[PDB]
Amino acid sequence: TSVYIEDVLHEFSTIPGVKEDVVEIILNLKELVVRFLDPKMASTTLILRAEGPKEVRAGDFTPSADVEIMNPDLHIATLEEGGKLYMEVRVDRGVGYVPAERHGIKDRINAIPVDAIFSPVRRVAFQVEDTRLGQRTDLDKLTLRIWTDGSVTPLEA
Amino acid sequence: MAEPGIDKLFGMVDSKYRLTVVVAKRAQQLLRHRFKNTVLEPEERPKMRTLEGLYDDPNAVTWAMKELLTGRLFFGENLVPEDRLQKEMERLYPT
Amino acid sequence: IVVREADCGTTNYISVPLFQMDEVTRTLRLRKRSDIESGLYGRVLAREVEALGRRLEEGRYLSLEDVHFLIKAAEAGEVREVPVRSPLTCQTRYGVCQKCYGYDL
Amino acid sequence: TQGLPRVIELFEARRPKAKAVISEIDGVVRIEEGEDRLSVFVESEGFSKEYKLPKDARLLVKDGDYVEAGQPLTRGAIDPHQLLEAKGPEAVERYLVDEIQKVYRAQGVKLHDKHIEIVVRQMLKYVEVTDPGDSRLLEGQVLEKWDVEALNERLIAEGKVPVAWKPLLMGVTKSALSTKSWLSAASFQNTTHVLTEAAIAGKKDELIGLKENVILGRLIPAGTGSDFVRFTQVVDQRTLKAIEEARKE
Amino acid sequence: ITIGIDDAVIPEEKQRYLEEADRKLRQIEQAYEMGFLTDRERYDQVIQLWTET
Amino acid sequence: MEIKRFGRIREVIPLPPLTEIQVESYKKALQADVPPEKRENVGIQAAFKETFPIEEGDKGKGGLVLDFLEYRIGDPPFSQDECREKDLTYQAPLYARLQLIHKDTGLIKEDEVFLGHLPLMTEDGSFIINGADRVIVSQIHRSPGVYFTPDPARPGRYIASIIPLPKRGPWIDLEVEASGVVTMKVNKRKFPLVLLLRVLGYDQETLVRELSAYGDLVQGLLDEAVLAMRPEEAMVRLFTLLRPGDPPKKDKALAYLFGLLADPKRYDLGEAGRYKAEEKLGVGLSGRTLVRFEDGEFKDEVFLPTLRYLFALTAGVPGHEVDDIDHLGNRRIRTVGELMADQFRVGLARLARGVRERMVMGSPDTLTPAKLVNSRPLEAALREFFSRSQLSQFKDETNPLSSLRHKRRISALGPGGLTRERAGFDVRDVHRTHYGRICPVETPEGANIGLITSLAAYARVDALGFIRTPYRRVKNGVVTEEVVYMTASEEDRYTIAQANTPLEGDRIATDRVVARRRGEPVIVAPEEVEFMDVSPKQVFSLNTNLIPFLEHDDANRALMGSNMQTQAVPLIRAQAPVVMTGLEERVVRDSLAALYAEEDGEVVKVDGTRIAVRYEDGRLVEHPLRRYARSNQGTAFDQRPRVRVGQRVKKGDLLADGPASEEGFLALGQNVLVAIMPFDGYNFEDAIVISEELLKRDFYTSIHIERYEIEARDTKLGPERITRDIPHLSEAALRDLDEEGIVRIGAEVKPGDILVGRTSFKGEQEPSPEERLLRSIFGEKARDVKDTSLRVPPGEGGIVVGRLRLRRGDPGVELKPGVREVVRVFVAQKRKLQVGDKLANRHGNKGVVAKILPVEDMPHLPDGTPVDVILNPLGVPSRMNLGQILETHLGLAGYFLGQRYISPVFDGATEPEIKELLAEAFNLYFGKRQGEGFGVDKREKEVLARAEKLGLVSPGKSPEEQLKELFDLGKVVLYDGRTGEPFEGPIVVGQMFIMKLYHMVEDKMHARSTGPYSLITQQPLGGKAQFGGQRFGEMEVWALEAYGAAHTLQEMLTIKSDDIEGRNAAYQAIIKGEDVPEPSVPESFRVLVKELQALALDVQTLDEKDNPVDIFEG
Amino acid sequence: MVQVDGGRFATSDLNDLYRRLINRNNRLKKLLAQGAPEIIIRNEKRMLQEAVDAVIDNGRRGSPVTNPGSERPLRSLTDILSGKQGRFRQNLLGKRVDYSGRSVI
Amino acid sequence: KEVRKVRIALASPEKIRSWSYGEVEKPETINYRTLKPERDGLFDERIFGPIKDYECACGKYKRQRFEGKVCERCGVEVTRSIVRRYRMGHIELATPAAHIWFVK
Ligand SMILES: CO[C@H]1/C=C/O[C@@]2(C)Oc3c(C)c(O)c4c(O)c(c(/C=N/N5CCN(C)CC5)c(O)c4c3C2=O)NC(=O)/C(C)=C\C=C\[C@H](C)[C@H](O)[C@@H](C)[C@@H](O)[C@@H](C)[C@H](OC(C)=O)[C@@H]1C
Ligand SMILES: [Zn+2]
């Protein structure tokens, strides 16, 4: 729902020793998918303590009590010598497509709110085939499909 | 579904613009005397629909048009003097 | 120019031709359907017109069906011109008059 | 000429490009010499008119043809000025309309004749004086300004003159400027002169037309603003029996 | 309903018509190789053939 | 993604460097790095040598000469960025070294003199003039020479035009009048020609010899025995007639000009003036029209044989023919360098006039150089040009292609070369001869159509400024490796072959060979041929050349697509198109909008702001990346790195991407899945339907930066001050401003919010007593200062990216008099698509987004994927932009076959090839289907059946093969997301490149009810809290008249504009809830009466019965 | 006569002319009631008229009356009428509406 | 009565001096430091009308019911503000005055 980057004061910034640039980073963080375990849960913060000459990688996030990053790999940042990264990224629960310019998350000064793609459901198709079952030759065979990010389960959905 | 029976209205007048001039002046008198002027009042009065429902239609123009096609109203080119038609109007709760 | 009153009260008019001359072959063709409506539709007949068993009272504002009727009465060799009130011959000076111009509001 | 240039050419009412020759009088045809210079004669017993043609002239009358006054002789455009004075203002009117529609028609447009008819009427709106009644005999005056001074100086207070006039073919723009109304005449380029001439003479407007009224921001004299309608008043039934109870006290 | 390219259907005649048009022209460019046609004359036909075609 | 090339014809030569016209001209007019001994005429050297041996009043008598020796260009006082930041012209000091001479001899070779400041070019091609980038656009005009032309005013006659190099001589016209007379025209003065001939020793006989023959035309030259007498006496009467007032015999003074010496008439040095007239006139010529100083007399050179040729052309020799004032053999380009040097020439000729005046004044033995030179003429003349001439544009910066286009722009209008926007028609038409030199597409639409134009791709401007195209040479049969750039003139001599023509190896392949000669298409023998085309590209402009299936696009819609691309706003996820013409690599590269390696080495430092690279020896360079800058157009151009920390480099491969660049391939928009069908009137007329799924993917979203400015001046009442202590204001208001009065970096800024605080003094009376008693007693003490800050204009705003401040006196900063300190604040926005945005493809399919549909709706393929845009078909056959269809089909292949393509113009994909790719692609798309365990569901069939009845499918074949066919045909069975059913009849679906354009609904659209009315006009404009009113034009008035709309019209002219009384009566009335006013007498009436009275003129009102009425009484 | 955002002014020109007049008028009112050499009133009455000129049709003669500074001719009582935005042409052309706005359709 | 015909004539010097209302025989007026005019000039409040909404200069009745407005040394009539566009001035010439329009 919202980020916060170390010495970064707006969306149109660029961190020293980071190849990326805050927009490209925000664009990446968009794709991270987090699982919630505790249904008591509503929102938390992942912490990206990241250092030096390395390739940041989403799995690099801080491990959290009841939280499961389902897309390790997935680029967050390329860091080159010196590059320090410290981040705090919010993760709320919600429905549908509610974008930054609407909700705006006020987690502190210079936070940046990010657009939200909430739906776990990824693609849905259904095939209406011809079954063979001792009545007519005029009966449907509905086979629904469904696709997710490992947070909600095809059946669960 | 345009305007309340607009074709039937043109028929009353000799020239298009008459209907326009009357519908104006009737809404004009209707406006001043907080609708206490109506010739259609009862359950003929025009209405709206809301988050509540059935509240009087604010548009004076609308009212004139429905009021006009009940025949009740009388318009004329020159019968009744204006200087005495202004004062006598304050008879049943004025402005 | 503004419609000032109905019936400037004049008897003048135009005769609108239903036949044409190409000035090259000295021939006489009955002019085009659209054009005849464009001469006659929504016009006020100047003096009475009779043809194909019908009679068109003077002052009839002649409808679209009317123009068709005339055209047909023109191929059936009965009418050639159509007498009709027009701004060209109106008497109101500072505009036209209802019974001239005619119709096409 | 064709297309939109031609539409202007007609309204502006100008000696056109390709001034096709028209017979001044009716008689017989007598084309002569197709080589050196080419010429068509129109002749009867009495009059005999000689029209000398460019050679490149696309005339379409063969020899010894009979002919009518004012009828085209060389093909192309008629100078609607030559037509007026040789066949009539009425006759000119019917030419113009017929000829404009010609362009609009042949490109593909349909629009009523009565439309063009109205404008052509204004192109004729004016007249020049011959032998005056109460002015100088050179003036250009509105046709029905000198109509009250024609069959009224003979309908009651008879005497002096009915005022003799001649028709004039003003070209739309030129028929624009020459208006009774100083107010609108002003908007145009030379504003001093209008206001000069106009002030010297008593000149009242009358605010007949539209432009005039708009200039002063007055309420347009048409539609809801036409005297014919604007005065209409409206009264209620209960209100009308509030006049039966108050007009005989 | 939609416009795919196959929908701009070419008549099977375009070929016949254009081979035909082609030759009546060959016999034209060879009718001026003789004293049969003037340039203006021959062109006035080449134009015209294509126009009918 | 991988790349598939298409079509034969390989290009014998790569494209020229593109920014050639611009860069490579100035350089050679500027001769910056060449020993001042070698420097050889034209450019700055020319203008110098043109004027310089400057003799004194009474030549070589009173001493003092002064002459040019050499010039030095300096080193620019400020950095390229320093200049833009501090509003400066990126300049250099041009000193010139001159020596002054006496009658008694001085060798005073004064140590250079400052002659003025000279602006100079970027590496890019552009200039910097007081901040802000600029483009000197290159102009075309008639080429110097002799011409003729027929008399348009006089049927069946001929004038004779003499044209020198511009601003170096006048227009001379000979024109035999319908009255015998011949008359020379010049300086807009017209005189009998004989006079000028009499001066050149032409007797009344030698005329009857060289100029009778053809007709009795000499009749009007001869009957003027009035002056066929004395040469000197001729000279006087001419002098008298031309420039009047002063009539003695020193006429030789004036007459020397338009005669000998490169004073004015130097039509050519070794250029066309002679060449042209030596080829179009009567052979044999030197330099100037008539040679004056021979041994005192004036000897003829051009005038007579012109008068001859004219005469031998009203009956005349066959082969004597009129001139084509339109042929590109008579149309030259004036490059930057030429126009600058032409303005540099104006400077000198002004400094000289000044120098001439001063030598006379001062004592001849005191005067040195530096003491004679002005240094303000040249400084001003060069200043005036770059800043103020119509040929000095801003800079089309929208995307990197735009800028490029802007350089290779050819104008017809402007200064000197002066075609008014109210002229020409054939001057607009595409001339046979534009072929290869100028694009026959890619012009502007309205009004300029034909007068503004772009340079053809392979084309190039030559020494004397004619455009030349490359043509391959053919040694009867063989097609050589040698190419020849030739004139439009040197071209009407050969049988040139199209590049379409086939070749077995390196020789022609068929007996009937297509070719043009002197323009008209001709089929020709393989031997007859004399040259070939290099590539079809040759023929069109760059933007034209960016259109994949141009083949099948109708020319007219192709121009719209050729444009618009210019209008493409750079996107966050820029992406080069799925189908290209190849050209997209190079357009990015030549634009220099993108970084590239210098000399194959190794990368070392790679972060957001820098790329530094250890080269092969060469030392070490760090390259900074411009990041989230702002275009001239608000575009927001920024660079992104595309290399890995530590890797070997490509001698010059992409180091970092541009703004519209994806991996060094021009990316002006996105590729996306489209359906070609109507929706529900949602793609009616030209509207487009969007899948909100686009927004989600941050697809068509772009960054735009606006900039705001505010000044500070001193005035009678005090100084305006950029304070932070704004009166009457909350701390809520100032929350965001540093101790200065300027907003912080990274503020979310809303409309109204304070951007820069500043306080004028203003002394609106002196606070009355009593109201100071209270002001003191209750505390709130009087103030001497007004609010007058900046604040964000209604609707604008976004996040505060950068601040910038220039105060009086700062290092190199000079700002306009009586102003001190300027503050600039930059705000940034992230945009996304919206209902009312304009999207277009390269085939010229424009249109606005009318509906973003949620994913639930939207046609979707059986596998599950929905489409991204629903484009109405009815907008196809009317225009003939058929390429857009062709391009979609391949894009369907590409989608499944997972590749990109390169189908160049008139040499790309052929249907069978696409179909084969489609066949290949379907075996996969259905390969998946059947592999994942599926096939032909009841819906698909329902369709297929009725599909063969339509006649698209083969009856007899199996539903599977039926599907394949239909697919291959570029079509497919589509499902309505809204109702699980299909649309009966298959729909064509694929990937299409589309761009989001310059214009956005965000920047358009306002609403006004009441707000700041002007203190000048008294109608609504100025918008300090809200926007400003729409205007009611004359045409809207007619319409209201044409309706019966009396009042509705009156309202628009009184209570809604200047009619203060009733204007206010209106507002009051509604606040209360009263039926508005009834403005009895309109103000504008009262204002009329009076303005008239103030001039006298009674002006008096009258009622019906006719007695004065009165409209005032107030 | 209205000021612009600061100390400086924006005058109405006709004032500058209604001023330049009473100026020359009183300096010829004063010059005549005490001490009248006729040679100088052949430079004072002549000079007064040419002020009453400016205030009517300033643009006349061949040398207009200019505001001391820029060569611009300054707009007169006649220039309040003639042409584009002058009170006659004005209502027929323009005026910005007070209850309005645009946007993409 | 209503308006039905504007009509143009010439102006008597007795017509002008009928419209006159005041007479501005006292020149230069364009003060800057304070947003008020200067003494009997083209911007005077006496001959023309009240500068602000009503208002004298030293302070008087800015009300309704009394009628007939002036003051002890500087009197400024009290009837609304649009008259600052309607109330005319007038200056008395020395002697002549050819009005260019009519001369040329
Ligand atoms: C001094 O420069 C001016 C000259 C005036 O004088 C005058 C008489 O001589 C002109 C010359 C010599 C041109 O070559 C020209 C031109 O090429 C052009 C337009 C008009 N173009 N538009 C068409 C449609 N549209 C919606 C907006 C603009 C012009 O009017 C002119 C033009 C004139 O009018 N344009 C085009 O057709 C094309 C192919 C592209 C334009 C791209 C962008 C938009 C512009 O280049 C921007 C970056 C600026 O450069 C201009 C705005 C200049 O304005 C300044 C001061 O920056 C202007 C040229
Ligand atoms: Zn009539």
Ligand SMILES: [Zn+2]
């Ligand atoms: Zn006072």
